[PDB]
Design a protein around this ligand. Sequence first.
Ligand SMILES: O=P(O)(O)O[C@H]1[C@H](OP(=O)(O)O)[C@@H](OP(=O)(O)O)[C@H](OP(=O)(O)O)[C@@H](OP(=O)(O)O)[C@H]1OP(=O)(O)O
Ligand SMILES: [Zn+2]
Length: 385
Amino acid sequence: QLHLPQVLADAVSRLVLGKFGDLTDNFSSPHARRKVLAGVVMTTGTDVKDAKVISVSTGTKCINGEYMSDRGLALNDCHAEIISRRSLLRFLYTQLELYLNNKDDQKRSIFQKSERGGFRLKENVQFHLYISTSPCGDARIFSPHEPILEEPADRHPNRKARGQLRTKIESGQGTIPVRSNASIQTWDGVLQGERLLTMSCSDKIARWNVVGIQGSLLSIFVEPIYFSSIILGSLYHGDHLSRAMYQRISNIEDLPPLYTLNKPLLSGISNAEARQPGKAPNFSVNWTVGDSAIEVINATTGKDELGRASRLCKHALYCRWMRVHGKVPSHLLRSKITKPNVYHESKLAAKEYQAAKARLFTAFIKAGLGAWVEKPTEQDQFSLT
RNA sequence: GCUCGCGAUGCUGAGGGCUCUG
RNA sequence: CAGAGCCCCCCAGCAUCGCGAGC
Ligand SMILES: O=P(O)(O)O[C@H]1[C@H](OP(=O)(O)O)[C@@H](OP(=O)(O)O)[C@H](OP(=O)(O)O)[C@@H](OP(=O)(O)O)[C@H]1OP(=O)(O)O
Ligand SMILES: [Zn+2]
């Protein structure tokens, strides 16, 4: 019943692991098998009773080059924390839908009207990201073991490798830097046997710490949302994590209004999780609050065991978003969208968000940390049917 | 305090086998 | 079908140590 850093940390770890318990027949389910667990916990006050597990996810793999969807039906990245953020997106959509059904529901929604336009978060609402381990890339690649109590020092802080943007690589292990002669990925190229690169999770969370967690489409509706804390259940290295999360791009400049370099609370837990026994599960469990049960997606194909699209895929989210745009008057829009059709275009409508993202990419380039690796354009070139 | 090159030893997503278990 | 253990091999980075060169 407190709001100290460590008490908070242990609290959200406890809550997420517990909720995952409730969602998997108390860890008996075959879908309880996991290597990395992640989740998001909301707080609406300094008391732990005012804390609510929003989303829970597992997974350690990414889609194969073969199975990319030009329709956006696949999950490109099923590393636990990424999936957690996507589930959080679903929750946000649920809350916007809450605000827009009847005036009676508004008092129970986490959103309210914004004197700058569109919607914003009610005071004292905070989100907290939990990961059972350090996010792949800069935050963990150096020292993938627990820290030792005598020498927590990097011992080689000023190396070029430090802070560098790195990518998950298809069919290979370790998270590798970006190529100096990195011919940007092509759709037909990747489908023709080329190796798919995906930005590491450290890099992605830094990105979230600049452009927000809501992504481009929700910035049409809502003001930027940031994580107030990042809790690691194991492999917590303060200096490395702090570097990866924000510190390495302190040199960033000229951010659009309401956009800051978020520096969330970083904290491990008192009792670190031991490495989960057995093979690393082929799949990725997800769950958002207000759902009947978990959803199991095959991480290699980005779909479930029967080829059905996930509720977290680009398409589904776009459908939710479209259904929110229908119910929102143009004078409550932060950005002008008027008549939306294509995914990529609707993303580009969030001009401020896109400018912030540009500032991020430039921030990384100037520090000598590399150029961000985008999916081929064809990925976001689709509409609903 | 670094960078590059060459080695040595480890650490961290594929592919292919062997054995066992419900 | 599902799971476990072991083995072989690949992946391109990271760590440690040792040589050579340079800032
Ligand atoms: O949760 P993630 O797997 O990281 O998904 C993101 C997300 O794409 P969706 O929200 O459409 O799934 C980004 O979209 P934003 O909301 O940040 O705009 C997109 O960024 P772009 O807008 O630049 O496409 C990025 O893809 P990219 O690789 O192009 O950065 C992509 O990440 P993945 O491509 O790794 O799924
Ligand atoms: Zn990751």
